[model samples]
Target: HMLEMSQERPTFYRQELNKTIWEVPERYQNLSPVGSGAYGSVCAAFDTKTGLRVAVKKLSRPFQSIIHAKRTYRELRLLKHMKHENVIGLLDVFTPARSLEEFNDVYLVTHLMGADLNNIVKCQKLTDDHVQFLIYQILRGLKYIHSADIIHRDLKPSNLAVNEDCELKILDFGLARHTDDEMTGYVATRWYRAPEIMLNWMHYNQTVDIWSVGCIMAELLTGRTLFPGTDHIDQLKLILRLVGTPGAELLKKISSESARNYIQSLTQMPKMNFANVFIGANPLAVDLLEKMLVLDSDKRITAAQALAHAYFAQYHDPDDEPVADPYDQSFESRDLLIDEWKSLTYDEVISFVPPP
Candidate 1:
């Protein structure tokens, strides 16, 4: 009789919810929903036991139609072992919020970092100092991630989160895979995507992220996406426009023959120096950007080597360099504010706004 009475209560429906929620440590309560994307919703919650505010990204439930859960499981396992100041630290993982039919989701807990690289760039102008500092942090993070034999299959401005303290953290590893072996079935977004992914070519390497860096670099300087193509053909055309159309000789050497012929089918583009394209951009920035956007993935610069390039030479400091820290507590240093979100806050903003 008691069992039947308990089943009849509306709140009793949550008994199954308690079974799953209770299994997790008492830390995850008072959750305030925050962000979302291809991965499910993110919530800013306070750990009741520890009193620490954390961002929890709930990875969508595995689709029953998905043929291989092993691939994504491997990604989560890799993320568990990865620890770097610039990379978002994984605190814990919880399986399924409820016994509902679609509750195969995985919960990923991480430190709270306020904005993303895209959000930062959209709000701040790229001074030479700013670009140098940001690139170094990005490559530094990539180096740590790669050292562990991991490939952040998707590395874009949106995937990069920056806290109030100006420390950058690389987020979203759902698409990330272990490149210690050959590349996965496929990965990366086309706009910030590598050429191999674009061409459906396999055997890609860590250099794919380098291609993303080039895209980010271009966006940083012009405040516009470099390959603004809406389709494959237009994307190819944009590449030709920036780097100039590749000739037959250039085509012969690349891994894919179809990639070569595809370009030949398009109209030729005019030659233009990347420096001229970005009027206020530093010359070294243009050089690094072009080097990263190489048509051939094999020829693309590695993140480690790019860290040592002349573009970073100006900001290189063995000590006291700008870096990414997951636990940064100060956002005022970056002069972050919602009202001024549309403009880029330069280093001088702090002086203009405060009692310094």
Candidate 2:
């Protein structure tokens, strides 16, 4: 039986990953499997160079599909330029390929966290302040993303990682795209899919993320998912169950004819009050959620506005909260091919500048 390694570069350390051999740099030692997904597999390793534990992800067959190729390139570029305390920072990227022709696999090393918020929410019973702080940090990081004119298409509990101290950082930019870039439908996780995306209500913007933040907060308030829909149709039904029916003005903006009719088909339903569902909870937390989970994206609170809400009054620090430089829009609109994406990703790895 062979180890089935991907590459043979002397500098690369190889081990079994996802039933095949994976290649990463030599300094990333004691590699152990952590998680696996359709995009790639992640392993925990001790980075001797950084003197810290890190997560090394192997991007398998990145250039296999057009969409796959662009996602790798986009994720690389996004992570490289991202600068914020709450956003996961890309530590390093590398490949064992000898040249562009052989640059098949891309490895991303990121900050290692003790656990993701999904597990934390499942295991621990969070208090009001704990929920407040976590919510604050999520918005804090999101404020930076929106400031850059980008939308984190996916913003669910699993994408949020934290340490023992409860320091939260947002991860997974593979699905993110420029706020006004080419629009797509049903891109993020179904549970976090905002009404704007699922219902085809205008091109999704940063406010779509606000809706997700509300879903996450509601999940934190209770250990159960707030809108656990079995399918897309069910999702909208489940959403209206609590958020209620959209207003006539809001429904008119829906880009989908069937989607507009779908909402019209449903009998007008009254929105559920957050206070009633989350009984005996923090009043401030409930109020902030009400503003965040609005049916109309126009009425939904902005990340900056959410930061200023009463729930985060104790934690708000205008001086400390930061927004990043808007993402470079130059290459964003250009259509790239698999080879071009490969070359671009290679350049990104060799040119990474570690933050000082």
Candidate 3:
């Protein structure tokens, strides 16, 4: 019973997504060439007169002039008031110009989210009931983006995507906001950033996107990247060697002086524990990844109470069955993060060779 009992409209694609972009227009623009970041190139468009298959994010206007193009137009006006199906579906918004003096140059049309959750857990092989139905559709799209008060300040797994059925949408809301004031240390994406945005504590909220969704549900049950760094003091020494350090009153009010010199060089990190580093991780996935990697972002874990944890009731199926989105189809594009890096194995590779 695909629902639809007595309705004039309000159909699937999250009830016709409030018909914006001047009411359904951008028909077809299949520029293919799938991924690339820092807002440069990430195509894959299609429309075929309302068939509606989007994912076109063509931004190259001089890299949106050093980024933050009005916070990507306020995240397309908060994805035009966000629709659901586990997030990611801002259907239309256009600006394609190579000429006419590139008129005010701006372009960002959304909902392409094919493969992101780190290329679907490093190109599939996921089991445990597909990681508890992809973490219960990413905790039902982070409890509908924290029930409206939005703060997905970049929850990771490459900002989760995958649609053609493998569901798990939740794409990049260009570092979302509106967490109702007070907390600060804004924006995310420094590989699951959080720790009151690495100590500068400009306030902070939504448990810093539930500590990037508990570091993307422990990299989807060990496919990898529990804290793979690329800076910010080695991502705070791999998040204080798996949530251990941070004692000195959790670095009392850090106002960035290089984040208090990276929390005084994280006092020689070494603690470690994350259920002894994932050895057959199962104690409700290390007790919900240690309360969603806490370091005081109000002690994390609140995406609607992380859907009553228990690692999403061990791969959810509580009657509603419709799951899919683990990179939602369409692969063949190649370069899946360097061809799945040596077919990942040694603890799902995160060496990133730097520490000389």
Candidate 4:
């Protein structure tokens, strides 16, 4: 029975454990579990050809449904396309599947990093200079993503990584549905959508990323979530605590009259001074945060502009920050069926040269 269950895959060593299966290749040796989730698991392994340690991500849920499959492809597509010093790039991709129907899993490879920003923020104290450099790298990464018109729907500490050297890079798809902000039972990813995303005032834009960076910068300063809302309603309530009630002009911008009425009815809050809230924080840093957290997207500090803020003057480099030329993020909206997605995704992996 066991033999029947395990077919010989062309490029894999199929190992069974606790009734679970790992179908990976020999090029990566001594696999140790890093973490596991609904889609798949990630492991730290040694890459024989490269003679270095790398992270191998095994994606196991690429064909669960149309939406799920498409999101899977989108992550792979973006990883292969994007390149930046501050953003994580793909090292290699492989699969054991010999054809479209046989395709059941995809493997992604990346350089191994020590820990994510979340772990570091929780365990250690960081200096002002440390904070400035870290935030500068994030802005630099976001500038590249923005130039490509990519909106990373999820931007939390865990989705960002930092090595022992203090270099941080953005990671993961974390993109949710553009249609709405409802919760799902399957994937429990932490989301940090902009106020506009919450209100549906306008289609998603790059400023949502700017807003998320504002929240992230504050978390770096205080080792806690700046807006840990329980749900949609509480997110607004929590934000109001810091920024206070929106003015008539601000409320009017939300296209939904219902959204307008709800803001008007909420308990009023006087905006708290940043100096008092972010006590002892560098004034320039606090000022940048204030500008970034602005409710009006029209005035929120852009990623490029945030790089130029006085707070980062010591580390800012106009010559260093680079932008990606615009490309087809539109495939993200395609209406392909499950197998079509599977086939195209396979081609993506096949495009990667196998390690010699």
Each model's TM-score? Answer: 0.71, 0.90, 0.33, 0.88
What does candidate 2's lDDT look like per residue over 273-318, in tens digits?
7788877678888888889888888788999998999899989999
Q: Rank the candidates by TM-score, best first.
A: 2, 4, 1, 3
Off by over 4 Å in 4: 1-11, 17-19, 177-192, 353-356
| Per-residue lDDT over 242-351 for candidate 1, one digit per residue giving the tens place of the 0 to 100 score | 77776565466656667666766777776677777876888888888778877666678887778778989865554532333232213223432322321211111111
User: Where does the lowest 10-residue lDDT sum fall in candidate 4?
Assistant: 182-191
The 10-residue segment of model 1 with minimum total lDDT is 347-356
**Number of clashing residue pairs, candidate 1:** 4
Q: What does candidate 4's lDDT look like per residue over 1-356, in tens digits? A: 34455545446797763246777788778888888876678888898978988988887777789987897888788888778888877888888878766888888888788899878877788988889999999899999988887877777677788888899888874356433434422222333558777766645567877888888888778766787777667776778888878877777777777777777898787888878877778889999999988887777788998898899999999998999878587776679998888788888877665443
lDDT agreement with native, every candidate = 0.62, 0.82, 0.57, 0.79
TM-score of 2: 0.90
| Candidate that scores best on lDDT | 2
RMSD of each: 14.7, 6.5, 17.4, 6.1
Residue 122 Cα positional deviation in candidate 3, in Å, after optimal superposition: 27
How many backbone clashes does every candidate have?
A: 4, 0, 15, 0
lDDT of 2 at 286: 85
